[PDB]
Amino acid sequence: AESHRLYVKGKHLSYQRSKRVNNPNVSLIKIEGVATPQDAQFYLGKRIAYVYRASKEVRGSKIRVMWGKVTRTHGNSGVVRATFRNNLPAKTFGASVRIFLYPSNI
Amino acid sequence: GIDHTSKQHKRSGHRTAPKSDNVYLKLLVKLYTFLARRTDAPFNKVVLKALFLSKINRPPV
């Protein structure tokens, strides 16, 4: 067809933070479509990929991926907490990111 | 935080393993620490503690 998307779009909002101290080890993700923790409970444990590009070709590609997963819900509005192998570079606040449907329970 | 009722990390204040560098005294306290550990007699513990003592705590008899 014309669409081939097998993931859900999301936005990298910020780190986990207090009013004046942030914590880069936990990122905050807005998954689009979900507006409550009860709907966000479907997406727990799903893999997340941040997909970006670079000028230098490394192993056949100019596209590099950072992997992570959803761990828990955050707040009352469907924001989730996500942890990555290496933390997200904080210039990606507001950048798009992919939530895959695996590991599936359905 | 703990509301400590005592001084933390304090030494017991009783001298063990005597401050002398006498090798025969160290052999004697090795023998008597074996005896105090395993013979379950109070005499061995008493003489083991008396072996640690300094000169002014060991008056001549």
Binding site: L6, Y102, P103, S104, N105 | -
Partner: protein
């Protein structure tokens, strides 16, 4: 001497591990996976394609087929955590899948010397595929539009919420 010595050397004998208590009970699959279910492949080379599930294998994998005449997916095994069990059900009674096992799919592992600088199929595999898919498509022809459904790919459109979608 430059360095003097260590007064004690550590022993070089390696100790044995303790006797473990982790036995292997078999995998308890989720309830939506019954044999004959149409699955959607979430990842892999054939991602977004709808296949039919036949047999639960020994290494917790699912035996699936396209059929190969419909969408070009061969006889294959997939992971149960990488599929979506749709509610669409066909009957796979009349297919002899006990031939396939974990030794049926062997990669014939490659040596470190054989490096592909620049750059085939088992005949046993191809007539096994031809035996099973002609038994599947006879069950496919009963209810309408299943051949078209299995040939078409799955993809998420704008406005599709997977937490609200029923498959």
């Amino acid at each position: 001497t430059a360095q003097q010595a260590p007064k004690w050397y550590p022993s070089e004998d390696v100790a044995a591990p303790k006797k473990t208590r982790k036995a292997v009970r078999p995998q308890k699959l989720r309830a939506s996976l019954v044999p004959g279910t149409v699955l959607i492949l979430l990842a892999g080379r054939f991602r977004g394609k709808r296949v039919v599930y036949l047999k639960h294998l020994e290494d917790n994998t699912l035996l699936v087929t396209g059929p190969f005449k419909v969408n070009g997916v061969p006889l294959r095994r997939v992971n149960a955590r990488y599929v979506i069990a749709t509610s669409t059900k066909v009957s796979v009674e009349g297919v002899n899948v006990e031939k396939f096992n974990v030794e049926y799919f062997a990669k014939e592992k490659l040596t470190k010397k054989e490096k592909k600088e620049a750059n085939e199929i088992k005949t046993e595999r191809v007539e096994d595929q031809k035996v099973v898919d002609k038994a599947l498509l006879a069950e496919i022809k009963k209810t309408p539009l299943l051949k078209q459904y299995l040939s078409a790919s799955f993809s998420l459109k704008n406005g599709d919420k997977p937490h609200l979608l029923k498959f």
